[PDB]
Amino acid sequence: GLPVMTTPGSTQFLTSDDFQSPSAMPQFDVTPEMQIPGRVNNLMEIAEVDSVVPVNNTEA
């Protein structure tokens, strides 16, 4: 019986938390990976691409 003291924040579901969780499908053999072109790693890779600007926003 290891002595333990629960701290504030327990039993809390923070949307942006990063804990480990038990797998529901143990030993699941995932399909292997494929080298699909155009892998994105950061959204800045997208933001750095030129895109046409609607300068003439006129209603019509």
């Binding site: 990063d18 804990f19 480990q20 969780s21 038990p22 797998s23 499908m25 143990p26 030993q27 699941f28």
Partner: peptide, 16 residues
């Protein structure tokens, strides 16, 4: 890092 679960899907995100 220390992983408690036998399946890689159980691990935390790859942020580092």
């Amino acid at each position: 890092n220390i992983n408690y679960y036998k399946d890689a899907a159980s691990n935390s995100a790859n942020r580092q």
